[PDB]
Amino acid sequence: GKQITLAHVIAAPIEAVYECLGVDHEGAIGVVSLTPNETAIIAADIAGDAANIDICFVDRFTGSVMFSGDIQSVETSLEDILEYFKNSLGFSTVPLTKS
Amino acid sequence: GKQITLAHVIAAPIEAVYECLGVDHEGAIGVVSLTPNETAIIAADIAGDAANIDICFVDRFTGSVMFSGDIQSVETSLEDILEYFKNSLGFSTVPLTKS
Ligand SMILES: [K+]
Ligand SMILES: [K+]
Ligand code: NA
């Protein structure tokens, strides 16, 4: 399985960030990547179910999801994803990384 | 191969995007994702060696790279990565995409 799954130009990345943030320009962005890639939708379901979280995109081909909301909501969603995948699906996990 | 390879919160994504663009706020961002993930460093080498391209990050564990520069330099670097992985390493490749 040797594949480039994404080779993409974001032509207007500032516009793209405001589009993901929506009305709350004080928001944070959460990003998850995982394998097998098709399980991205389960991360998107967990994040998208939180009251102040919006999904920006889900990509089952690259295995990625991006979402936004207030920082506490985004951190809690990421923790919920790590916990579900580890405890319910036997996935190995990384630390919750912050920038 | 069941792994969460990235679970990341960006607290200030507008500032994050301007730091990645650097001096040229009218710049584009290129993003590559691939498998096996460890080869992401070769994509970052190819992009990074181009005179008008700055690497924003490379993550060998997730298989992703992000880099910035003028739109034509970013597109040329993506084409170069796609040609190298296909022709030198035998990788399957997605089309070069843009949003
Ligand atoms: K929601
Ligand atoms: K360079
Ligand atoms: Na570990």
From Swiss-Prot, chains A, B:
Q: Name one GO cellular component term.
A: bacterial microcompartment
Which Pfam families does the annotation name? BMC (PF00936)
Its primary localisation, in coarse terms, equals other
Signal peptide start-end: none
Which InterPro entries would you find in this protein's record? BMC_dom, CcmK-like_sf, EutS/PduU/CutR
**Ranges for the BMC circularly permuted domain?**
1-91
Q: Which UniProt keywords apply?
A: Bacterial microcompartment, Transport
Localization recorded for this chain is: Bacterial microcompartment
- SMART domains, from UniProt? BMC
What role is this protein assigned? A minor shell protein of the choline degradation-specific bacterial microcompartment (BMC). Proteins such as this one with circularly permuted BMC domains may play a key role in conferring heterogeneity and flexibility in this BMC.
User: Subunit comment for this entry?
Assistant: Has been crystallized in 5 structures (all are mutated, 3 have an N-terminal His-tag), most are homohexameric with a central pore. In two the homohexamer lies flat with a beta-barrel on the flat face created by the protruding N termini of the six chains. In 2 others the hexamer is not flat but has a six-fold screw axis; the screw pitch is 33.8 or 41.9 Angstroms depending on the structure. Interacts with the BMC major shell protein.
Q: Which family does it belong to?
A: Belongs to the EutS/PduU family.
> What does the UniProt entry state concerning the protein's domains?
One side of the hexamer is concave and lined by hydrophobic residues, the other side has a slightly protruding, 6-stranded beta-barrel.
Q: PANTHER family given for it?
A: BACTERIAL MICROCOMPARTMENT SHELL PROTEIN EUTS (PTHR40449:SF2), ETHANOLAMINE UTILIZATION PROTEIN EUTS (PTHR40449)
Q: What is this protein called?
A: Bacterial microcompartment shell protein CutR
